[PDB]
Design a protein around this ligand. Structure first.
Ligand SMILES: [K+]
Ligand SMILES: [K+]
Ligand SMILES: [Mg+2]
Ligand SMILES: [Mg+2]
Ligand SMILES: [Mg+2]
Ligand SMILES: [Mg+2]
Ligand SMILES: [Mg+2]
Ligand SMILES: [Mg+2]
Ligand SMILES: [Mg+2]
Ligand SMILES: [Mg+2]
Ligand SMILES: [Mg+2]
Ligand SMILES: [Mg+2]
Ligand SMILES: [Mg+2]
Ligand SMILES: [Mg+2]
Ligand SMILES: [Mg+2]
Ligand SMILES: [Mg+2]
Ligand SMILES: [Mg+2]
Ligand SMILES: [Mg+2]
Ligand SMILES: [Mg+2]
Ligand SMILES: [Mg+2]
Ligand SMILES: [Mg+2]
Ligand SMILES: [Mg+2]
Ligand SMILES: [Mg+2]
Ligand SMILES: [Mg+2]
Ligand code: NA
Ligand code: NA
Ligand code: NA
Ligand SMILES: [Zn+2]
Lengths: 75, 56, 212, 103, 107
RNA sequence: GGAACUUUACCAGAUCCGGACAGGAUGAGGAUUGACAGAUUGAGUGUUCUUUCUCGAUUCCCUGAAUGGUGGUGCAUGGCCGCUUAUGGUCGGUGGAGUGAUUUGUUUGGUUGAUUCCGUCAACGGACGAGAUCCAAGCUGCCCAGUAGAAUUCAGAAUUGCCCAUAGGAUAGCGCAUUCGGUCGAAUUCUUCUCUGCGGGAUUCCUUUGUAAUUGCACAAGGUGAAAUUUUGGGCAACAGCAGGUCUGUGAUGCUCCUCAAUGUUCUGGGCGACACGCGCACUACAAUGUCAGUGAGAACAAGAAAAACGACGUCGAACCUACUUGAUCAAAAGAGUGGGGAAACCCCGGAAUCACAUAGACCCACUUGGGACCGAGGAUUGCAAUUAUUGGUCGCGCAACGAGGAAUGUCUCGUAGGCGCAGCUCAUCAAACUGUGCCGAUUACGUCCCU
């Protein structure tokens, strides 16, 4: 037996893990658009998934061209 | 993700955890005869309304 | 395929019990005394019995339409298949449900338990009841709980005929100290048509016809 | 001779089911249709036995709750319009009347 | 499983809540609630509906009743007043429970 | 409360906010949400991290607050239940008695299970309980059947008289010989059996050279009868109480505790099962009034499938239970195919087990063909998951006790005890439990206050 529903307050070996926050990208549309004097070009490729908003720009991570919705990675 | 893991075992819908009292949501001592799905304590309080009576 | 007869009556009873509980919780301030329904090929025709007929109705039927929408959404009734009606209780004092709710309201108004219970007993007997019994239990005087019973007139307890001759109701009272249980039992008088009685003499009463 | 229509009357109330059956029979006799006979099917008793206590203390006492189901059937050789006319009246609450065509 | 209710779902529940003055939802944390709007069908998670109604109740925009694992939420006068302002509905618009009755609910 | 996960309240860990709302700080090219891949990790878990996308005013951010809790306290409570207590008990009004607490009523006596009655009476009138009422069973009337059955008459079939066994006893037949629920015949007629909503029927009714009575209330034997005393078995059940149980039934609840590395809520794993031992309650036995292997005749109460889901084009159609066939040119358990049933309709003419058999069957008093505990190996089945055997089936193990059980101790008086199975209930899978049901069916007493 033991104390009924009591806060033992044990000691944690692993340090407390932080909480994830959105990484701000200032002027994301500025980096996506490539306005050559004016013909605006899309540096990121348009989505190849019609159901997942056909035309939404994918990511440009090193060696990965995934999208946010369809998650159709290119590598 | 966390949404995929959230209540994944409950989504299976088998065993006592799937079932509950239709009146009080308790999962203990459920009467499943005639598909009543009412816990015994709730059934005693609501027996007359359902139509049952205490004969012999 | 179609449900068996056993399953059908079980479904009807469960629906009635749910409907009764919903109406009792909703129309607590009104003297909700019972509910009946009659399913036909056209509609459902739920009839609600209450004492404060205008209060449950609302203005232009606003509340009764709200109740109809609640029942229709809960049980997935199609359009033009559910209809609600409000009927007034013939005698307020002979309904145990109405009196116990009134006693609950009196106790929440911070009144003396003895005075409130005697007032309920008085009104019940002026209504024409053969007897009335009121029970109040819980933390009344102090920390130590106690139960007091107030009686007047006739009241039968044993057998099976007491179920037909006695109307009973119990309610919870939520006070600052805790829960208070109120019970009202009314020995209904004989009625010709059974609207306010069982329409039968007591099981142990024998009457000898006066010769002509 | 003609098509046969089956009236199935079921109710939890014995008095209600009997009154509906009598009213249906009387209306059929008024319409002069050939009825076979009101057959009283066996009464079915739904039994639920539960422990009285809500906690499991003391002598293990039990509650036997019973629900009785009454069923009647009436056979008559009448056109569907005539059976609809016979059936069209005010029934008691809690009584179920079903229409079946025999083949 | 999330209470992050999308805005399009919010006004869809809001549109139903104005058309029919009450909303009934079973207290199942893994079920889906179905409405009608004006003839179509839309489904929104019950957890999102309960979160929206809890916000309305905390603001005193609705009245809440509960019985047999089912919620019943009903809009009061403040609720409909806020309801019209949010939806930008035409003035004097009233729910089905407040439109002209012409129906006798007596006996 | 028969827990593999869930239940679950416990343990070792990781998730989510399911902290509404209000006020602040922040915030449009961004308040936030959600994630590819690699690595962190038990987690091809965006949990967190690197990297970027995506979301969008839904949310963070912090202060109060709020919320949830099978957290405490049943010695703060409601409700319910158990017990006091299965017996006959309980209380006013007015009147009598007492300074008063209180008493009388509510009693000498007899009778009754009964404070049930008669009778008496400083009490008189009442109220509850008891009785009555209610449910079920036994007999019976009306009604009634194409969801129950029966009997005749024509057809269609089968046995058919000389037969006496391996040794073949006992046991009714002495105008027309029997048999055929597949003969998936055809006509008639009917309500003996069955179904059941209301009725009937039993009450001390009848009779004693009876007990009593000199009055009554009644009792005992027999009669009548399906039933002869509360007909039988249940349900209900007063008034006073208990610091009985339950905060592990509820959106029943005061006070109190935790509340974003939580006592909330999920997910993973383990535990609730863990054994030198003690105790309650069961199951199986110790064998011949038996065990095996055959064969026969034969119950009752009961259960059975699903939607604001999904597939098909506002209706079926698959979840449930079953019958038949197949598997089968070769074990069981399986696996399949087809058909039926919403349940008096299919299961089903419900082939239950005790039981019976002149079965000319095996065993022959022994831990033995008694007893199957423990254990090994193959295979199948339920489940998302079977290891700590889920559960059947097969062959082994039977050298595990146990040969009738010390002191003590439980229940029981008629279709009862005891035995014997069956159904329901828990249930995806699993009854040595419980709730009911029928089958086979006694010994003893019908008495007492010795024990309690
Ligand atoms: K006095
Ligand atoms: K074996
Ligand atoms: Mg009485
Ligand atoms: Mg009685
Ligand atoms: Mg188990
Ligand atoms: Mg577990
Ligand atoms: Mg766990
Ligand atoms: Mg939040
Ligand atoms: Mg918890
Ligand atoms: Mg709780
Ligand atoms: Mg207590
Ligand atoms: Mg208590
Ligand atoms: Mg305790
Ligand atoms: Mg006295
Ligand atoms: Mg105690
Ligand atoms: Mg508490
Ligand atoms: Mg245990
Ligand atoms: Mg034998
Ligand atoms: Mg053996
Ligand atoms: Mg597992
Ligand atoms: Mg095996
Ligand atoms: Mg042996
Ligand atoms: Mg058990
Ligand atoms: Mg004694
Ligand atoms: Na007195
Ligand atoms: Na006789
Ligand atoms: Na429960
Ligand atoms: Zn319940």
């Amino acid at each position: 037996g033991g104390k009924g529903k009591k806060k033992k307050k044990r000691i944690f070996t692993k340090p407390k893990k932080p909480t994830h926050r959105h990484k701000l990208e200032k002027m994301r549309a500025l980096k996506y658009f490539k306005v050559t004097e004016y013909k605006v070009e899309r540096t990121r490729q348009d989505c190849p998934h019609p159901q997942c908003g056909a035309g939404v720009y994918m990511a440009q991570h090193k060696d990965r061209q995934y999208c946010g919705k369809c998650h159709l990675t290119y590598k | 993700g966390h949404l995929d893991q959230w209540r994944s075992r409950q989504k299976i819908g088998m065993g006592k955890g799937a079932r509950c009292c239709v009146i009080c949501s308790n999962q203990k001592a459920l009467i499943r005869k005639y598909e009543l799905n009412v816990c015994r304590q709730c059934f005693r309080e609501n027996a007359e309304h359902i139509g049952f009576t205490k004969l012999r | 395929g179609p449900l068996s007869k056993k399953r059908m009556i079980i479904r009807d009873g469960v629906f009635y019990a749910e409907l009764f509980e919903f109406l009792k919780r909703e129309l607590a301030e009104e003297g909700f005394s019972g509910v009946s329904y009659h399913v036909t090929t056209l509609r459902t025709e739920i009839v609600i019995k209450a004492t404060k007929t205008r209060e449950v109705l609302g203005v232009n039927g606003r509340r009764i339409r709200e109740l109809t929408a609640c029942i229709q959404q809960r049980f997935n009734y199609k359009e033009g298949k559910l209809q609600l009606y409000v009927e007034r209780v013939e005698v307020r004092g002979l309904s145990a449900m109405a009196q116990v709710e009134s006693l609950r309201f009196k106790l929440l108004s911070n009144l003396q338990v003895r005075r409130a219970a005697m007032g309920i007993i008085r009104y019940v007997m002026e209504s024409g009841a053969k007897g009335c019994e009121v029970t109040v239990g819980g933390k009344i005087k102090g920390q130590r709980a106690k139960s007091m019973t107030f009686r007047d007139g006739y009241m039968i307890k044993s057998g099976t005929a007491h179920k037909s001759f006695v109307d009973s109701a119990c309610r919870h009272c939520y006070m600052r100290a805790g829960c208070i249980g109120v019970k009202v039992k009314i020995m209904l008088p004989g009625d010709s048509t059974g609207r306010n009685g069982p329409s039968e003499p007591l099981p142990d009463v024998i009457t000898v016809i006066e010769p002509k | 001779e003609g098509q046969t229509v089956r009236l199935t009357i079921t109710s939890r109330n014995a008095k209600a089911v009997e009154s509906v059956t009598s009213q249906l029979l009387t209306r059929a006799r008024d319409e002069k249709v050939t009825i076979h006979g009101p057959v009283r099917l066996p009464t079915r008793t739904l039994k639920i036995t539960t422990r009285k206590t809500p906690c499991g203390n003391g002598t293990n006492t039990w509650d036997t709750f019973e629900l009785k189901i009454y069923k009647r059937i009436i056979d008559l050789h009448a056109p569907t319009e005539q059976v609809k006319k016979i059936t069209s009246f005010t029934m008691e609450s809690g009584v179920d009347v079903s229409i079946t065509i025999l083949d | 499983m999330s209470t992050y209710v999308p805005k399009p779902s919010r006004d869809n529940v809001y549109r139903f809540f104005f058309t029919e003055g009450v909303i009934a939802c079973k207290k199942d944390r893994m079920g889906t609630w179905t409405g009608t709007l004006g003839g179509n069908t839309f489904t929104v998670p019950c957890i999102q509906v309960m979160q929206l109604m809890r916000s309305l109740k905390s603001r005193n925009l609705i009245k809440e009743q509960y019985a047999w694992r089912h919620y019943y939420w009903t809009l009061n006068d403040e609720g409909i007043a806020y309801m019209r302002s949010y939806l930008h509905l035409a003035p004097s618009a009233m729910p089905n429970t407040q439109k002209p009755s012409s129906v006798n609910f007596e006996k």
